[PDB]
Write a protein that holds these residues in place. Sequence first.
Motif, PDB file in Angstrom:
ATOM      1  N   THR A   1     -21.312  20.908  71.443  1.00  0.00           N
ATOM      2  CA  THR A   1     -22.300  20.971  70.369  1.00  0.00           C
ATOM      3  C   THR A   1     -22.426  22.421  69.953  1.00  0.00           C
ATOM      4  O   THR A   1     -22.764  23.279  70.760  1.00  0.00           O
TER       5      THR A   1
ATOM      6  N   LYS B   1     -20.265  18.453  66.387  1.00  0.00           N
ATOM      7  CA  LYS B   1     -20.425  17.739  67.655  1.00  0.00           C
ATOM      8  C   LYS B   1     -19.100  17.051  67.969  1.00  0.00           C
ATOM      9  O   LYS B   1     -18.585  16.285  67.155  1.00  0.00           O
TER      10      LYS B   1
ATOM     11  N   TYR C   1     -19.065  15.634  62.884  1.00  0.00           N
ATOM     12  CA  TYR C   1     -18.924  15.019  64.199  1.00  0.00           C
ATOM     13  C   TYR C   1     -17.533  14.397  64.372  1.00  0.00           C
ATOM     14  O   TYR C   1     -16.809  14.155  63.401  1.00  0.00           O
TER      15      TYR C   1
ATOM     16  N   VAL D   1     -25.099   9.382  61.751  1.00  0.00           N
ATOM     17  CA  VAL D   1     -24.035   9.602  62.720  1.00  0.00           C
ATOM     18  C   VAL D   1     -23.926   8.408  63.663  1.00  0.00           C
ATOM     19  O   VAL D   1     -22.842   7.860  63.864  1.00  0.00           O
TER      20      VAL D   1
ATOM     21  N   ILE E   1     -22.648   8.713  69.579  1.00  0.00           N
ATOM     22  CA  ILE E   1     -23.360   9.981  69.451  1.00  0.00           C
ATOM     23  C   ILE E   1     -24.786   9.703  68.967  1.00  0.00           C
ATOM     24  O   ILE E   1     -24.984   9.118  67.900  1.00  0.00           O
TER      25      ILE E   1
ATOM     26  N   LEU F   1     -28.432  13.679  67.572  1.00  0.00           N
ATOM     27  CA  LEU F   1     -27.655  14.888  67.324  1.00  0.00           C
ATOM     28  C   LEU F   1     -28.542  16.070  66.932  1.00  0.00           C
ATOM     29  O   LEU F   1     -28.626  17.060  67.658  1.00  0.00           O
TER      30      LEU F   1
END
Length: 370
Positions: free
Chosen positions: A273, A312, A164, A138, A146, A149
Amino acid sequence: NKITPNLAEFAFSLYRQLAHQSNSTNILFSPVSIAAAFAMLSLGAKGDTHDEILEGLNFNLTEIPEAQIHEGFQELLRTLNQPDSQLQLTTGNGLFLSEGLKLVDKFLEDVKKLYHSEAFTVNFGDTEEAKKQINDYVEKGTQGKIVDLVKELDRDTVFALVNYIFFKGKWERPFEVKDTEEEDFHVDQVTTVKVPMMKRLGMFNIQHSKKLSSWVLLMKYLGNATAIFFLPDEGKLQHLENELTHDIITKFLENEDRRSASLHLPKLSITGTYDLKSVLGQLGITKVFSNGADLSGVTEEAPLKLSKAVHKAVLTIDEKGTEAAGAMFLEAIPRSIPPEVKFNKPFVFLIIEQNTKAPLFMGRVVNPTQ
């Protein structure tokens, strides 16, 4: 599009579930991102497992052809990834399956040409080693926006899905950093916090709605996206959350009328989230997270189920009407006295893609500092 209405209903459906669990939490998620994540997964599922997912995404398999569905998501995800998009929407899917596993190549293929997704195999035996990888995927994919996570991984994890999405739009008609200053924001009837507030006197597509008991503001983003903000009157937040429908929103988008107004909008950054298993479970999607999950579309011989699924979302709202300048509009302000509209209390918002009318984001800001 054609699957837009279904997505719109999925979003409100999911929004209300999250909003009913609490009224003091910020909310931010992407209807499109999540629905496409599972519409994709439905390609490697069969029977009830497969049917449960598409219906949990608000699709009536009794009136709509599956090919139509995937057909739509391909086009939608197609336009969202245009390298020449002024929008700059960075979103992705992380498919992580246990190492040493026979995966139908036809699946790994569709997940590529249709849902622009990436599939990876990893050693789930080493928790603190596979988890460090999933997060490195990510991060290296979100320009580092980000981080960390995934907090933890189960023991018998064999299938994990990471969804995401990051977004920071550029206003067609930007604000001036020099006018941004701290103002009170009412987290409740008698409490306030300070937050940087952007302000500009200008011509806005803004109006007060009696049916919704709210101020409705529409602002355009470079790249063909529109932000719709709802500022409910005193005590009407819940009322607003229940009256919203896809048609209501469509009516507001057909209006191009602009009126004078001194607008105050907070500059802020929000993140959402969510545990897709926990959340999507209340919407009726469970079988795919169980042992009886029919995922023979992914693996052909071995038993498989979705162990973990995370979403996310990150949204930043600031003055900038791009990294740089150039064009330069000029609005003619009437002499009449303009109304001062301040978004200094909880408000709900949607970010709509002008082309498809699909909701890219839906959220609520209750406390800008939380």
